[PDB]
Amino acid sequence: VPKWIQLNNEIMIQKDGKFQFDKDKEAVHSYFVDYINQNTVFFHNLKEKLDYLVENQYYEEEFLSLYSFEDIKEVFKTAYAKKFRFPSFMSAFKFYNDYALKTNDKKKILERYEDRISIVALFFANGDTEKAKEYVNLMINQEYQPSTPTFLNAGRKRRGELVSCFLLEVNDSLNDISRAIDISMQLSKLGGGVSLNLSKLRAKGEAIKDVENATKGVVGVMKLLDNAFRYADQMGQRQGSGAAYLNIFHRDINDFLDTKKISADEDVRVKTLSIGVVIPDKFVELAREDKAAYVFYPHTIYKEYGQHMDEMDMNEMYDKFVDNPRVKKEKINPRKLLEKLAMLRSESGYPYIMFQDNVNKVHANNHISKVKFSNLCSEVLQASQVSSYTDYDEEDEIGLDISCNLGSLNILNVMEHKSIEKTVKLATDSLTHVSETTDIRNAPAVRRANKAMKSIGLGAMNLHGYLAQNGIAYESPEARDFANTFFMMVNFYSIQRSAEIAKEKGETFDQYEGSTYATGEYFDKYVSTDFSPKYEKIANLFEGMHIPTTEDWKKLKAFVAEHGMYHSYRLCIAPTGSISYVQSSTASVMPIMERIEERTYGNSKTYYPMPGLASNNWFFYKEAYDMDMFKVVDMIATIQQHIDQGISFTLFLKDTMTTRDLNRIDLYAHHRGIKTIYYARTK
Template structure:
């Protein structure tokens, strides 16, 4: 058996005999059509041979262990599930190929079910003529289910039957074999389209092709088939992944393809509840939310000059919490929102406690994710162990050139903040020790893994579109950094003759995240990045054109900025396969070089798209338009490129961007890729691996997890909790040099090894090295951390 595993299993005619065969007994099974027949072991062996072919496993082992659990009257469906479960239980770092055996067994089951439902025969014998896909049924599949409102009828309007047949024959069923068990299980449970009775109606390659067809609709008609094939290849070869809403909803009637939305709430009762309504509508269509509440007056603030009347921020937080619970996305999962408050807000101490298990339960909001916005001035005072003043935003309005305190950043903010410390009435401010406030924040981090941190001055200083807006906070997963603003309510009017009430308002900037990620396990060399990244830019720009918008403000913002976010998955595997240790200077140099290449070809791809389709509306006056990328001149970027060995032509690119513009105002954002990393068998996002073997528990059940090629690189991988987290932050700082937005950067701490001062040092280092955000602080003592599925790409 060992020899077989080392050499790769070669089929043998020798087979284990079941107990029933040895005793001459006959076992009866129930087929899918309900008929009863004697068990034919040879049919089971055909399936096992198919599943094990070419893999380093012993099929006799699977057959023997599964047969122990056979029983009289077992259904063929149960036999298949038993084989799948048995194979999945065998996955280990020493024998990772069992995950592909389990995947093929599940695929075989899926092929049979879909073939039976759609009325075509999937042959039992796995030979050269075996075709799990039936290209002739592809057009009929879409036509039938478009009529029933399950697929979008735009597919039939934009593509002819001949187009469908051409694309059906372009699909490559062998690419299904790229899935491991977790990948195909997650895809089966959550992404493949189902009919009204819950039956899966499409196969994985059909899913990818229909998504590609949807995203190619904005292309010129004569180019549409070409781009459909290119988009399909990127997805089906697992070179890129798209965000969960895109994977779920492209090809559906409501093409809500965006991942996350960021709302700015004004200090106005009408606007507060208008944003509550927006939050409900966005959550209804599976969008994640970031919500900034820093403009709302504090507890005890006046209302219509009546002192002490305001209830502050906490009641609004609780309302939004209840909305996230109530709008539960068809019962699949709760809505999800991060809520950001500034560290100078007078209610910040109470806000820090919303998820802790101590204190007044009436002030808790356990289902939202708190985030704190921190200016440089606070970090300076923290280092100097100085005092900090909490202020009521009500008294911080119109403080300079018609702007509020929260509308300022950098030196301008510091000047006005220090003036307000002196001038604001005593009952509208509270002086605290900056270090004590920081200690309380870190204590909550230890207890809950949150709040998320947003370094607002860094975010705004390096905002390429600072000429037309301000960034107050980030999104749910803290990788999006884009301009935000409140909507302005104009008037309500009544037509007394009809009873028609019309509400008019001027849209603010509601940030929209349109996300996709590169699989660094497959795409990291220059030639591949040059080929893949511009195509991904095009795909995400098409997401904007095809998108269904739950709220009109999102449509307005999305079309003015056309912002996208390109991220990555399989980062740790990419390091490992290049023989790079996480805790090494070589890692930092590699990260710098790799992300420069990604940035260069993302900008170049957006520039080429601007030549074809026009630049984004607000391009003129941006840093991009001045040749300033990532806060640096073209000459500075050129020098950095020469230093790291890429030798890319940043000066020439800057001149082209000045001439033609960019199609997209924002381009790069490293989002978490939880569920989509599972689909493509990748390590998640930029995180180190959680462990060399563990079981992931999610909506698809308990799934065995091993990193890619763990048997080959066992000693190269190092688990997250064993890595010195300063190296996580240093690597993040190298990547950030080439990212116009931010990163969902997690910290992994062992409370037995990391105390308060060490944790404080990590967050201070993140600020010092220029990171814009810190996402979760994951602790060994915290067993439940909610993943953001919306941003997963």
């Protein structure tokens, strides 16, 4: 057993009835001194290292060619001047096992944390040395963490795409289904997760060219997609992961849900495809009143009205569909369907829940389209337009797919440095650069939507960590007050940066004029309401930082009306799992699952205490399974009111909880304005 691993395992060995938390610093120091320094390649100078990395097909020479070697040396010195030290063994282990560049044989280490940070900053700056230094300071201070794809692949010749989340609309035709399979395989080949909307596919038993009962429904396409994702499993290094979304009013909803039953037959069972359900307010209203509900055949609706069922307003068109003899529908029990969803989530954690009306009542780009589904992580909520892929030698009608490149603010580090504005603006710049340099040449809708909408996702992490290290309970009203103020500030500064970028480039996103930003309806609550902390304790946390007021929001509204917005979507809180160890932070805005994380790496078990965990803050590091999910919903709803996209919201359930408790949590989240529910985790 490695010496550092033995030191780490001493964490759990109680001394004086207390965990030996100081053993992790010794564990990380031993890990470095005994493995990392030994296995780190030696280079006489930075010039030689850069030459070796470029010539040996490790780095892309184009982005490094925009700087004189003096500027590159200055940037690397800026990264190294901080003398950054990993506070725990797990942070350094995760970095040097996942993100640190290694020789082609995976035997030696070519990049340190400073080297990766400097390369990422130089890639972001796009030839600006001062901007590169600012990015280096942001990342080395760990105020901002680029998403795993960007952090790992930026500046590397043999790299996947820096965007890893894609949403695909599928039209009701064989050409569209085949193109969807091809695009999913192409995108999974790039390492990105693919979410597909299957609500426009006709249900099982529908006619194909005036021949009845010919359609296999969404389950056959689901089997096709599951096999496609299994085949394009990223060369075996990471199994292909895809998500399928179906509106609850789709006739195949019960068959769609049954694909995740354990007892499901292997023919119908889908193994590697995640499933989410889009629930309009109409379904919740029907279930609340216990009224018999109907699920519709999409193709009958399309023929009767000329539009897709998910392209129409269900809250208004449900009665018309029920009263239309030319629309085929199946009677269902809405409460039975809700209970089936709860039981399926308890057994497997699926499906994801998207509350469509919660998403679209605040959606700023409803003129472009309503939000119909989410991504594989359930935090992407953007307008999409379905593409029409025609026969060979015909012209395809390319629509708008969804993709956003992610980055996370480190809430603890941002608050400690009092740099919400600067960090948010720099992260927005880096995400804009990543979006601009991204070009998928096998997903026409994805490429077109990336060019037209310029969507980015700026997330946050270490909310529970920051609160616990400041003596604030995650479920307390003070925690919600802090989240309200912090995310209001984040939204304000991201909007300001988007407007500044639009002014500098003299260009907004496609169809901005019809958005709520253009009309000013977006800023109504910000100009009419105040979001400064209501608790003196929280207000003190923001000392030295300007909290935007109603006057500031009015000025920002006027500025946006004058100059517009560059990004259709800016903020989305993704789960941010792997890089949380490197950042030494709690994942996303969710509460911690366990105070100390027990992991197995090889035959050696590693112990990871929650970042900042200690005797004096043990009580504030309350585990998620012990919290009231209603309070977690309150926190997420407080945060979600300042996020234009969704928040990846996992539910942490105890094994004693019945399906009724899960249903109550779902209904409260829908009541509280929650947009999506990611996972039902049971302890």
